[PDB]
Write a protein that binds this ligand. Structure first.
Ligand SMILES: CCCCCCCCCCCCCCCC(=O)O
Lengths: 215, 200
């Protein structure tokens, strides 16, 4: 139980192909084991009263990978959205829907959708690209102020805390406008090895930040 | 100096921790910035020595100018001295920031187009991420368009965040946090960051 909680947590559920290779599995076979961890993060966030969580699903650049991996991460993303849809969330999917790569299955979540009891915002980046996001604005806006509040991800507010699994300390183009001031916590374990303590340590790190220091 | 297997093309530096450094030494909060000038030179010297192509220094942002006036003068004066000390060396200097302000130092106006064209050192001075992206009014028209993708961003003072540095160029950057405050810069801080980078 925390004095200070982030309003909005970003999750980069990385390490799936490494986890699978380490386990004696094929690379493409780790993604199926990323679905459960997502559901557990959702569970703990609801439980402590986190307002909003954004999951990084897959990028436009991720779809340049072997088809056996694209099929596998895409299916795992589809199923995570469908499963949170079975819970008590306000669900939103953001991504380039003007592409055959965007899964039909997720179109119905491209406007925020209340399921069960609601009262937690869950976002998924699906066929997302930072360049697509920033320039969604540049195309046919009156000015700079309008351009920025009309990025593709404009419905997603500033990220307070970004937690990335798989031990890499990088944003991989997740929400460059919303992450300018995000505190970044790296978990060395791969996403399918998610444990609650990963999120609890990320929340202790956020609480432990010195609020006198400014942006 | 270690022999490096691979090096980044472009290092970003966030020289943070100056105020905590001064407080820990019983000095005034604003009295740590001037102890950040020589560390800048040490980084420059190591980067030329090992042949890094480009370094961008976070100097100060528009958000930083909300700080007390006594802090603002100390960090602005230290940024001006750091640009001047690098300008004496064999470096192509570029300053990026909002010059349409009383805050922008007239001394640095001559670096707002890259000098000695033909190591590249960039400084962000009265820089703002919102100001940068809105400058066009795309990749090539933002205020910082001359500054390419950052490969490795190294931040002193223990905080793991960009504080609005170059949102476009940092999207894929590998980030290395030194817990020590910037005035406590040691050569091994930069070497451990390069060992991190080559291990990715
Ligand atoms: C610019 C090269 C070195 C300059 C010497 C240090 C004095 C100016 C640097 C101020 C750094 C401010 C970084 C603050 C980051 C943040 O906003 O959290």
């Amino acid at each position: 139980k925390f004095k200070r909680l982030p309003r909005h947590i970003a999750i980069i559920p990385d390490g799936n192909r490494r986890w699978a290779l380490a386990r004696g599995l094929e690379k493409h076979e780790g993604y199926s084991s990323g679905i459960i961890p997502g559901l557990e993060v959702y569970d703990i966030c609801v439980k402590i009263g986190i307002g909003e969580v954004t999951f990084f699903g897959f990028t436009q650049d991720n779809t340049k990978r072997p088809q056996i991996q694209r099929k596998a991460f895409t299916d795992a993303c589809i199923k995570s959205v469908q499963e949170i849809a079975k819970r008590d969330a306000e669900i939103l999917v953001v991504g380039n829907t003007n592409s055959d790569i965007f899964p039909e299955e997720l179109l119905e979540y491209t406007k925020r959708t209340k399921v069960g009891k609601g009262k937690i915002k869950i976002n998924f980046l699906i066929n997302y690209g930072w360049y697509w996001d920033l320039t969604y604005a540049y195309d046919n806006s009156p000015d700079g102020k309008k351009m920025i509040e009309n990025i593709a991800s404009a419905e997603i507010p500033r990220v307070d805390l970004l937690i990335r699994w798989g031990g890499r300390c990088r944003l991989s183009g997740m929400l460059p406008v919303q992450t300018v001031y995000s505190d970044i916590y790296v978990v060395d374990e791969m996403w399918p090895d998610f444990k609650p303590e990963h999120l609890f340590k990320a929340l202790e790190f956020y609480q432990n930040q010195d609020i006198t220091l400014g942006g």
